[PDB]
Nucleic acid binder design. Sequence first.
RNA 1: UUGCGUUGAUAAAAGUAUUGUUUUUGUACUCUAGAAGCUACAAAGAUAAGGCUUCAUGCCGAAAUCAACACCGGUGUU
DNA 2: TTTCATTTTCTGCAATACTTTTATCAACGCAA
DNA 3: GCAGAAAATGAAA
Length: 831
Amino acid sequence: DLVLGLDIGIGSVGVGILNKVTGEIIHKNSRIFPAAQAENNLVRRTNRQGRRLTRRKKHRRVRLNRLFEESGLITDFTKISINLNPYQLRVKGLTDELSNEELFIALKNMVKHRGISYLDGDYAQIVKENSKQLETKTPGQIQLERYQTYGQLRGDFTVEKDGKKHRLINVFPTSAYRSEALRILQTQQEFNPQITDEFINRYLEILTGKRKYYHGPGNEKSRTDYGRYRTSGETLDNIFGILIGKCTFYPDEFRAAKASYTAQEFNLLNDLNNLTVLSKEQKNQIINYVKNEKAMGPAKLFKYIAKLLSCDVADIKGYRIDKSGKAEIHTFEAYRKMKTLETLDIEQMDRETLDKLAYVLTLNTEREGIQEALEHEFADGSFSQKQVDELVQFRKANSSIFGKGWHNFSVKLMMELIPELYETSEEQMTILTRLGKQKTTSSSNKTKYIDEKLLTEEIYNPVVAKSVRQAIKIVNAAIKEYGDFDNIVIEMASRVVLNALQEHFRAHKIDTKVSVHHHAVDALIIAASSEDSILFSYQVDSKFNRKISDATIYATRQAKVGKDKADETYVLGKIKDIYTQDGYDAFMKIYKKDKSKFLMYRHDPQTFEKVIEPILENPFLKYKEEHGYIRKYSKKGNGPEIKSLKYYDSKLGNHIDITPKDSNNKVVLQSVSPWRADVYFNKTTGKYEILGLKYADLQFEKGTGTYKISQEKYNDIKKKEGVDSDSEFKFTLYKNDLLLVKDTETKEQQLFRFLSRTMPKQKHYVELKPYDKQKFEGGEALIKVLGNVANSGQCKKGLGKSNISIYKVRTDVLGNQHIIKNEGDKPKLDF
RNA sequence: UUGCGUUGAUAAAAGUAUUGUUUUUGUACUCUAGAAGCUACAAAGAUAAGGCUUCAUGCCGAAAUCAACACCGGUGUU
DNA sequence: TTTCATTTTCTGCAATACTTTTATCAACGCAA
DNA sequence: GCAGAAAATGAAA
């Protein structure tokens, strides 16, 4: 027999298999994986909600077009001018008549910009200032006056006053926009007859329509799995209600609300069973006294207990104590605060309907959720309208009683325990032990190996779950290839994996004691506390929908730059905020490199001399403190301000194209990300051909909607990347899929990790990463057919040379190599 | 191991707002009613490439899952 | 004798202000 | 950290 030791880091797990009787090393491995932290799901969720916002904004504008076309006002929306001022139109719309087109433009600009709606520190002060200025005048007048006096209204800006300054923001409450649109539409209804009251109703629905935070996305006919409408066919009416946890002894029932009747009964009965001096009659009497007396605290109930016992408060153990505080026990605070209603009584209703009413009032917060839950939950309830409105006002007034949370047990278990704790004096622990209910079962079937799923469901962090899953798969494969063990030592929360390992070794009668690169050697050290032959094994990344490129959008111009004698397309750049230190550094870089790369030096060169004078005399902050913003040259000092210039960055190369329909110049995206490669062989010339795909080449198909790459497009990539058609498809390679190259004249070989096919002009180049390390500090010497590594840290040597050979290797989880050389007749393009 | 009070941290999911980059148009600025599309400001369109059917409080797309192949939860090969 | 075809460097990358729910861990006490 | 063109090389013609 033998011993396994196992070291678990953040993003690497290493093994060591040792002998107890001799002291030999049997197997070592250093599996590496990316540590899945939670920045990527935050980026994914953030981008999904941003896409939803932009979607709904564009759909708001389309809904406004359909509203204006179905009421028969106008017909064509490609004739309307876009060179008016809408703010002036809104201010004129307060006073007199506008036509159909003018009103269309005014309401369109008003739909595009509604305001915040969470009202109904340094940011709240300024929107409060806009609200305090808003009381005399409508926000359209605020924006218009800010325009006519300062020339600039959009975004936050700092405006020079006579003694000080202030910062102005464009944020206003949406009730301002509601009142302003109401006054505008009422004046136009005085003047124009075609506006109906249903028109202003639907318009104020569009202008102030936000979905509630418990509705989610969806529709009756949409059926996404994110909102209350669901794919299976059941509409939830609140999405957070399906996320409520389960019981601890009946794992098919949800929890009970903490402000119900049975929860407060169970809590008071356990709290008075806890106390050390009671009988069944005194329990019933004390429960009736807490139920019927009004405005009591803990000390009043303790004085009533001391009256019923005729003894002083002395040697009374079992009272719950709060921090630096006197005795506090459970009172029927929720029941009594619902007894202070007047529209409906509580004392004679039921026990069932009080539990369901407390569930409804605990879950929903707003008016509509509470009203719809009262109408949909209560079969044969039939509440009246003033009862419902008093219930909503009661929930809104008391927000601490109904915002405590949910109990642990269900109503079944507590209703079972209640009649067995009136007679006896036992707490819930001894009653649930005596009755045998201790199951809380959760398991899954297996025969000979450990299952990762039922252990991994203990979630602390995703990184601990990922590391534990890789360790359990290693233990599985070592058990498969070596039979059984005699000791397993695991060194990294750890109590759950310890308990699962001991449970699996207890249930299958194995007597193996479970205990508590560089990591392989430290795993050997840990296995003792019970190299060239270090073999590695990486994790292959073959997911095909990651981030396709960068985010910035670029503009292109056709201009001769430098020592060129032809017209090519250059990609523009832009220095923003020329008065900052970084803008001045970038300006001096492009100035000392080549002054003709700016666009202000070609068109309107005279003002560049005006820009020449501050650099010749004195940064531009000195000129701003002297005289203000640098102006474009004019006869007077009426010149426009200068804050940003444009230059020519570089030529155009590999790109994605998003060019709009009416555009004189190509609009691109850059830095596109690669997916996998396809190594081909040419039999005539005797060389290899390395094709390469990117994420932006796969796309959704217009017929089905599936995710695949076509055949003609793949042959187009075959022609562009420069492979021959009568060639032999050898294999593919993903990220971190190992690769053995070998020349055929000395027969010396080396194996690397694939990374990416780079530099798409120069053909058959491969970026490749080391077998053991990942850094490549400096240039370490390689095989003589390949050369030396570049002195910056990147390696992008060239394949496709004559007298060389390329084989794929695959390692298993223990790291045993398997060298293969041909996989199929054709690559796979369906997943 | 189970329950009850406090107070911190995290994770999953939902609803909004104002910019930013970029395209067309207008006004100012420049040179001779035109030209140039630089420099400001204001409208309107796009905002990961892309895609669906139900015609709309419409919907999806940046995470995790992993050695492969062949013959009868197991079994063999390179 | 310039010109082209392969190997190395080196710069550059989207943000901010609110509202709400559910679950899980810790530690400080009362109980078996 | 990495996509990739710009500046720097070496081989021919």
